Amino acid sequence: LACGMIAVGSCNGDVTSTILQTIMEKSETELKDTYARWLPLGLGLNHLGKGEAIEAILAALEVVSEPFRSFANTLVDVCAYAGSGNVLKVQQLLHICSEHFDADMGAH
Amino acid sequence: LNAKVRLLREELQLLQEQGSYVGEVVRAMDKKKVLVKVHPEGKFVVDVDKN
């Protein structure tokens, strides 16, 4: 959260790399903790409002285990398109919200 | 004559069916509802028969 707040909207390479390293170094059971939810947020804070600069970041996040991968991807994508009004991204988010699950899988 | 007899026998059962209240219509509403005032019993929002 801090390193994101210092480097908010800056697309800092060092912060992105170390956040990715921390995220993929953690175990799948470790990612069940909600404090891990802050790891993408700072990453998302790094690329706040940048837009289409997350495709490399999204490709990197693809290797992360699930359901934390969906949470991280949604967080960073939203932070990238923050304050833009892109109706396409809102449509994607509403499609994510459409399919409901009978909690653990539905965090994102 | 048989129809008269049959109607007479069914009339005994028909007369035991409860009578209908008499009300005054305040106004019709949507979805075939009517605001009525039963004579001693205030107001009601009642349905309307299909006929």
Next chain:
Amino acid sequence: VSTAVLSITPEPNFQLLDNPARVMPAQLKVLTMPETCRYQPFKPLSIGGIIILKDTSEDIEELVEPVAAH
């Protein structure tokens, strides 16, 4: 449906009935075996019931295998 597109983006006239034949009381007046068949009924086929059949030929007898009770 997919996502909405946003701003940007010949009955037959006869039937062959095998033996035995489930024949209606009305079917009897309209049922008649093929002419070329090797068997010919004794009484008219419209009478119904159990009918003996004269055999025109003396070939092998392709009888009907009895079925077993349930």
Next chain:
Amino acid sequence: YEPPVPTRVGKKKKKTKGPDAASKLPLVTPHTQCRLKLLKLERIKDYLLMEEEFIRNQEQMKPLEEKQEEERSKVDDLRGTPMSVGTLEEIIDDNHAIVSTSVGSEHYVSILSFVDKDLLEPGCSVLLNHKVHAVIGVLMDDTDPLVTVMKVEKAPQETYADIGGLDNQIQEIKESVELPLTHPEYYEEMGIKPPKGVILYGPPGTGKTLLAKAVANQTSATFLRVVGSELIQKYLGDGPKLVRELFRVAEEHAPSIVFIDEIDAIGTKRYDSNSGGEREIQRTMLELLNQLDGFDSRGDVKVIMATNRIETLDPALIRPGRIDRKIEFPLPDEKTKKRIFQIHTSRMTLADDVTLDDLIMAKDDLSGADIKAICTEAGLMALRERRMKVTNEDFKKSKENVLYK
């Protein structure tokens, strides 16, 4: 045991009435057919597309029990039939209330979820289940016959062009009841609220009610007309109650214009049907004082009063803040008399031997009502002789008819 605590602040219903509800789409600017308005409309359209797809999906995988028509049918089943009409006596909790049926028996029942809980206020007519008396709805109260009595349904046909000589009076009344509605930007840019009240005073027949009719013709606000003598009731407190309800109805139909015609007649006339004497009239006047300028916040309600005896009114009633403008209607002068005669004979077919100059001085204290009566009675005399052309003899008989005898 502990009493329940409501989560809603206050006990009154929501002030907003008759809104666009869910159709409150954002106001797109500019109204000009430009690409920016086009883009804003497209953005609204894309949000509506996304909403439509989402709602369709949710209803698609919703259970057969949970469907819009199925849920409406379940609401109907929960309400049952018939639905009794009771009175909301008290809101004990968010989902609990004390309601009294028409037989006078009270019940502590439960307010169901589908009830519009912001429509619930004490004394409001509620719809209850026939068996369990649980609140299942709120009955939209029909318009009161008194509401119909005040409201002027059809605008009067008298326009400002039918008024002669009252140029200054027309200007003053327009600055208070017409200009604030048609051109509020003047007042907003000047930093002043419009003149609050207006009272039209003058000798009888000078055109006060005619000017009120002209205002009612060219107004976009609801027009309520009440005669002062109508405020005198037969029972104690019914006068103040009537004034309170008149201004409540005025507040309901905002913007509105309240025309209290012949206000002085509340005091200058004594009727034996008034149980309370001058004291009940004074209490009604105090209620009128509170309504004109009192504790309760007043919406877009404009008050017009008319009287031919303004010296008999309580000075606190017409004080500034209650009635800002006091417009005088003097007896017409010769120019105004000629204009009035031309106005009321415009549809007439006058004879060549009839001159309005002679009729201008029929009486020294001639008013517009006298001139209109002269014209009407002269037309009546022409009708008696089966004529369409009004002669000077007809007007001569008219003068001796209306003015004298």
Next chain:
Amino acid sequence: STYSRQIKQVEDDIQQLLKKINELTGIKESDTGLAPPALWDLAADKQTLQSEQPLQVARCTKIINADSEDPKYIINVKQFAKFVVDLSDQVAPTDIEEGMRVGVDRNKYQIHIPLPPKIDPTVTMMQVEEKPDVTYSDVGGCKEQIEKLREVVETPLLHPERFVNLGIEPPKGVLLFGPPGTGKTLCARAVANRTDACFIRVIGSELVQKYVGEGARMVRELFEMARTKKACLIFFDEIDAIGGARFDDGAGGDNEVQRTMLELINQLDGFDPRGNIKVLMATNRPDTLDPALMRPGRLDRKIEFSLPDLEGRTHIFKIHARSMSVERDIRFELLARLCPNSTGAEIRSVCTEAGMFAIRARRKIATEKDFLEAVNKVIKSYAKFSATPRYMTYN
């Protein structure tokens, strides 16, 4: 105009889309008081309809054998009947008292829930729920009057600790009096805006009722519901409607209104303590009020809203011309000097008429000449209809 065809196309599409959305979601009826379907908890509604039984409202009358383990309660079920019942197992015996409203079931009428006392809906609506848009900054020339009013009606509620420590009992009643338009109701609205306790506005004409004893009943219920709050303020605007002095004119002259006033007086200072209610009355005819109502313990403070002096009139002119688009050199002191005995309402009308004179001339700025004409029209020309000279004999 080049976009007009596409404008109408997309507008019609939006309207059709809105109708389609309303088709699936809801928004209909609204005459039977139906909430939007997004708030429909139908399963909970069914569970409430089954589990939560209706309860008829009755009034407990007498408790027989309250000491023993079988206390019987005589209840009066409104217009229905009278019964001898027992409490349900879920109600403590000490939670039901004689004379209080209870709610009982329809089968055995056993008392199920104690209920709040019955209050007239007209009395309930008298409490203020939307505070007025007037602050103390909108009242000019009443510094001492506002201070005296606040240290009685606002300070004890805000900081009671300053009073209990010194054994100090603050005054519990204020009468604002003065000529019409001087700012009595304006100061009351300021109090209601600043107050945090329950504020109830009562107009004297609202206490006049058709039937005998009804006004006293409304006063009693007003003070009953005012006592159901930790701190409360009751405003009696135009108290001279019912607060007139008692008299005997042979006939029954104002007997019922005198009984209403006597009930109000008994509630203010009688055998029973009033409570934490701090009353506030405003009238332009304080000479007509009953001497018992004008007595300390019922109206402890008597704040006079006399006509503003020169400084007060200048302050009012500044207050009302604050948002005016006035010229640069408006001599508001001169304007205040030009209307010696004028209420604040006349000053507000002077400002409004100066603005109207400027507007009528199609000018966006009001000059000093406009204010002079406004003074001539309001203070001088309208002086025939002034309520001031007659009403300062009453105050």
